[PDB]
Design a protein around this nucleic acid. Structure first.
Ligand SMILES: [Mg+2]
Ligand SMILES: [Mg+2]
Ligand SMILES: [Mg+2]
Ligand SMILES: [Mg+2]
Ligand SMILES: [Mg+2]
Ligand SMILES: [Mg+2]
Ligand SMILES: [Mg+2]
Ligand SMILES: [Mg+2]
Ligand SMILES: [Mg+2]
Ligand SMILES: [Mg+2]
Ligand SMILES: [Mg+2]
Ligand SMILES: [Mg+2]
Ligand SMILES: [Mg+2]
Ligand SMILES: [Mg+2]
Ligand SMILES: [Mg+2]
Ligand SMILES: [Mg+2]
Ligand SMILES: [Mg+2]
Ligand SMILES: [Mg+2]
Ligand SMILES: [Mg+2]
Ligand SMILES: [Mg+2]
Ligand SMILES: [Mg+2]
Ligand SMILES: [Mg+2]
Ligand SMILES: [Mg+2]
Ligand SMILES: [Mg+2]
Ligand SMILES: [Mg+2]
Ligand SMILES: [Mg+2]
Ligand SMILES: [Mg+2]
Ligand SMILES: [Mg+2]
Ligand SMILES: [Mg+2]
Ligand SMILES: [Mg+2]
Ligand SMILES: [Mg+2]
Ligand SMILES: [Mg+2]
Ligand SMILES: [Mg+2]
Ligand SMILES: [Mg+2]
Ligand SMILES: [Mg+2]
Ligand SMILES: [Mg+2]
Ligand SMILES: [Mg+2]
Ligand SMILES: [Mg+2]
Ligand SMILES: [Mg+2]
Ligand SMILES: [Mg+2]
Ligand SMILES: [Mg+2]
Ligand SMILES: [Mg+2]
Ligand SMILES: [Mg+2]
Ligand SMILES: [Mg+2]
Ligand SMILES: [Mg+2]
Ligand SMILES: [Mg+2]
Ligand SMILES: [Mg+2]
Ligand SMILES: [Mg+2]
Ligand SMILES: [Mg+2]
Ligand SMILES: [Mg+2]
Ligand SMILES: [Mg+2]
Ligand SMILES: [Mg+2]
Ligand SMILES: [Mg+2]
Ligand SMILES: [Mg+2]
Ligand SMILES: [Mg+2]
Ligand SMILES: [Mg+2]
Ligand SMILES: [Mg+2]
Lengths: 99, 92, 60, 60
RNA sequence: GAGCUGUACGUAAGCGUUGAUCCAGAGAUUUCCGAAUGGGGGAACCCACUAUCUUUAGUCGGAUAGUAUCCUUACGUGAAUACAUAGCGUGAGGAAGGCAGACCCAGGGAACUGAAACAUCUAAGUACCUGGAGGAAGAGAAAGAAAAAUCGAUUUCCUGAGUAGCGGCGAGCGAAACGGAAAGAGCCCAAACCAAGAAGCUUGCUUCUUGGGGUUGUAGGACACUCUAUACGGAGUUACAAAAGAAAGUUAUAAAUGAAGCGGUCUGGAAAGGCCCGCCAAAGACGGUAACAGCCCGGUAGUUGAAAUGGCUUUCCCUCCAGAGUGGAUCCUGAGUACGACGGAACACGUGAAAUUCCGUCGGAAUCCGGGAGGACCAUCUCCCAAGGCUAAAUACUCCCUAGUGACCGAUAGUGAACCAGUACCGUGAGGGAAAGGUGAAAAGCACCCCGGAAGGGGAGUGAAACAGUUCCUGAAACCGUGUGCCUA
RNA sequence: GUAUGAGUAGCGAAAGAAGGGUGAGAAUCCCUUCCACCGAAUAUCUAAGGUUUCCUGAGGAAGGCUCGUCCGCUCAGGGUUAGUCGGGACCUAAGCCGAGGCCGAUAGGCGUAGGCGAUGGACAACAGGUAGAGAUUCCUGUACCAGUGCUAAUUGUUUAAC
RNA sequence: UAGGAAGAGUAGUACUGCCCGUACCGCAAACCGACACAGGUAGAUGAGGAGAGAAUCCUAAGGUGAGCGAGAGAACUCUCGU
């Protein structure tokens, strides 16, 4: 996966195409990403110990990784990513000669 | 034989707690430990004076969760009674 | 793991015995119902295994 | 085990034809005789064929 | 290089950039049964002995190591029996069992069936049982093939050819050599002779061991002399003798880097689709992504990379080594064998005019002025030296691993088995042996209200769709119903 | 897979009645009284065999030839205590295995020493208590068998107690 | 008896004694019969009146009321009584 937890994201396709957000979790076992404010769902949950009043809950749902491009940190555009050896560790370098 | 590996765990239930005040303690032991290994293991671990040991062997019950029929584990239960002039064991 | 290899192969068995007593106490408490940090059992088991492996490697 | 200890003759198999050529199985056996000879360094009773005793042997 | 504690949701408790989970090489641990091996046993169980250590005041208990049988070989004891042998004990090596339902070598070896019946014959040396292996096995360096001339170990393929032959001359069985190819490779003993030991002393001999020599058909060798070489040169663990060690390179087992569109617009739940524009390409293989993607993701072409272990190839190291001529006086060249009679078998070849090869039983040669074969046999000629052994490649098969392919199947098909399948179930047992795939892009898997004990419904809500609500895509026919236009006692 | 026969045959020997209770629901579950049946058994133990069917708290989809609030059914927790009882560490019968051994195309067959093998031989514990589930086992009282150590006297020591 | 022998019994005391089975059914709805099946299943105990009796009828201790019912009282079929 080219996207990790804590990065900034621009969504490319889907019903919520064209917006931005910050990744909250990653599921590399199944190629899913959870981004705040994207792909909200309404869960009909019974009352229980969690959320004692129950009711309809409005929470995010995971989306596929391919629907996500990592925005350029300095300029602010989605871009493909490349790897360079800086120091003794591999860093991620954009296609606009950035980080 | 490394006494802490032939005494497994206490048995806590109404049947065991009812006799617990009779200075009788119920334990789980290995399926291979004998009546005297258990006695010396208890005396080594808890620093008591054992009077008797009784043992019994239990089969494995047959459970299921739908299409998956199997057997529970195999048990060996020991009731250890200590002498009158000896400190007790807690369990609590 | 490397904190063991500098011990003089005799206090390592003291460590093993102390760990065995701790593990027996942990099973005791778990069976009674007074154990809340159940994650310590696996840690103690693996520490015992580590010490035994290092000792066996010591004698080749 | 029923075999000569010098050469190695034993029973073999074949047919027993008749007039009208009706085939049928049978067997040919060696002329083994039980005699006493020095097998390795000591006398011993073994099976020896009559052909191995034709000229030159230990006893019988 | 950022999540992780499997399927498996879940709660709980935790661990991770001081680098976890994960992937590859090398190690450590490895309960009990099973060849099962200390004795026994109805599988995973029971009971021991001998030494050392250990706890108890002592019995009781614990830990560690050894203890099966047979073959080979050393040492010690040791009966009838005097020497001695058998037997007994101790030590050191080896074996035992499995399987890949395949391939192949040997021992034993059917019947149904065909002959329009059946017995010789066929099926067929097949099925099967037993033994032995090997990655291949078997065969293999002419006592050969053949004919007016020659070839030069074996194996496999194409032809010869359904020919010559065999055959109640019926049904049927059925070659080989020459010719053309793949692959190619040759060697080691026994015996004369020489040197040393001990022995029967078969007593001035022979007879065993050890080493050297030498292995062939124009005969060769021993034996004699002319020459050189004792490492000048040569060979090697796939035969030719055998066992180790290094250096380099390559390869197999994890991986790294890797170009170009968030292009505009229309429909749509969602664009990879339509229309109008760009670019990359040694990369337009494949798969995924909310419908059909070279330019979104994993990747692809190309270029890189191995700490560790294995394979392979060279080199070094190491080891081991005589080969030519001439005379051949005299000696050697595989004995109860080669053959022959009798009884069988294998040869395409069924006893036939029956050569060739093998087995059982009897008889039984010559040995270089010698012996065998050329489809009975004799004479002449031609070819060749049996009764000892070893040998790679070309060939057969696939339980497996890696990379791919298909005018191969698509859930009654394809493996019996796409799913907890040799399972459930059946049988005392050997053994026989199934049925069973699909919600949705994402659980967003229906909060809340009403009837009901519940199940199940009617709304509401999510969703593009609920006539997708947990046999859930599509949903035919048989079959069961409700309503009605025309007819019917 | 689904029909016709068809709401048809059958519902597997037998005496039940009423009053209370529970429950959404009662001929069928619980309690009471009366009646009836077996009684060399339809009673009490105990081998083989079965393998959790045993007990408690919940349950009513399927199983129960009807119903079910119930169950030998479903779910979750429990429950089997031995020096003296039956069997091993004791013994052998029929039979089975069998070092060497005899026999035999292979495989193997037979068999000596030796050993396994009860349905038989020998061997030390009785009476009460136990309100969810064990009792010659646990508990109470009184015993017996084999062995060990610690004390106190006794005796014997290589013509030699034992 | 052959053998082993410097320790031996005696009395009192305290201590030691291993493994396997143990639940429940067991003329039965839990075993063998595909079934909650009118069949089959070794042994010990097995009371009273009348009686020779373990026959026969009625009962004791103890155990049961049998896993479809109610109501009518036809033909015919089965098992019984005159
Ligand atoms: Mg017991
Ligand atoms: Mg024949
Ligand atoms: Mg083998
Ligand atoms: Mg026939
Ligand atoms: Mg025939
Ligand atoms: Mg075989
Ligand atoms: Mg070969
Ligand atoms: Mg033939
Ligand atoms: Mg790319
Ligand atoms: Mg487009
Ligand atoms: Mg679609
Ligand atoms: Mg002949
Ligand atoms: Mg012959
Ligand atoms: Mg001739
Ligand atoms: Mg010829
Ligand atoms: Mg001729
Ligand atoms: Mg050969
Ligand atoms: Mg289909
Ligand atoms: Mg199928
Ligand atoms: Mg069965
Ligand atoms: Mg789906
Ligand atoms: Mg509902
Ligand atoms: Mg529809
Ligand atoms: Mg679809
Ligand atoms: Mg239809
Ligand atoms: Mg009718
Ligand atoms: Mg009726
Ligand atoms: Mg009935
Ligand atoms: Mg009533
Ligand atoms: Mg009566
Ligand atoms: Mg009677
Ligand atoms: Mg039983
Ligand atoms: Mg049963
Ligand atoms: Mg059950
Ligand atoms: Mg019950
Ligand atoms: Mg019901
Ligand atoms: Mg019912
Ligand atoms: Mg039950
Ligand atoms: Mg007692
Ligand atoms: Mg006993
Ligand atoms: Mg007994
Ligand atoms: Mg034998
Ligand atoms: Mg025998
Ligand atoms: Mg005997
Ligand atoms: Mg016995
Ligand atoms: Mg008995
Ligand atoms: Mg007794
Ligand atoms: Mg009871
Ligand atoms: Mg009692
Ligand atoms: Mg009973
Ligand atoms: Mg039944
Ligand atoms: Mg019934
Ligand atoms: Mg019955
Ligand atoms: Mg009377
Ligand atoms: Mg009577
Ligand atoms: Mg009564
Ligand atoms: Mg009734």
């Amino acid at each position: 996966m080219h996207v990790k937890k804590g990065d900034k994201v621009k969504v490319i396709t889907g019903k919520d195409k064209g917006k931005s957000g910050k990744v909250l979790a990653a599921f590399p076992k199944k190629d899913r990403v959870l981004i705040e404010g994207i792909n909200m769902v309404k869960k009909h949950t019974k009352p229980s110990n969690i959320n004692p009043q129950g009711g309809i809950l409005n929470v995010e749902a995971p989306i596929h990784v391919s629907n996500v491009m990592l925005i350029d940190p300095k300029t602010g555009e989605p871009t493909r990513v490349g790897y360079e050896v800086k120091g003794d560790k591999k860093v991620r370098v954009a296609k606009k000669s950035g980080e | 034989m490394d006494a802490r590996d032939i005494i497994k765990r206490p048995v806590v239930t109404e049947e065991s707690t009812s006799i617990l005040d009779d200075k009788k303690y119920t334990f789980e032991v290995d399926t291979r430990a004998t009546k005297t290994q258990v006695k010396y293991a208890i005396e080594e671990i808890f620093d008591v004076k054992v009077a008797k040991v009784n043992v019994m062997n239990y089969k494995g019950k047959l459970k299921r969760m739908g299409r998956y029929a199997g057997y529970t584990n195999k048990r060996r239960k020991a009731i250890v009674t200590v002498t009158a002039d000896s400190k007790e064991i807690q369990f609590f | 793991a490397n904190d063991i290899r500098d011990l003089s192969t005799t206090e390592i068995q003291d460590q093993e015995k102390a760990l065995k007593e701790e593990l027996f106490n942990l099973r005791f408490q778990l069976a009674t119902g007074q154990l809340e940090n159940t994650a310590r059992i696996r840690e103690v088991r693996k520490a015992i295994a580590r010490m035994k492996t290092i000792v066996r490697e010591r004698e080749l | 085990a029923k075999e000569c200890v010098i050469t190695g003759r034993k029973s073999r198999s074949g047919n027993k034809r008749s007039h009208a050529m009706n085939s049928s199985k049978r067997t040919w056996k060696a002329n083994l005789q039980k005699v006493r000879i020095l097998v390795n360094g000591k006398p011993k009773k073994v099976w020896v064929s009559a052909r191995a005793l034709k000229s030159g042997k230990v006893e019988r």
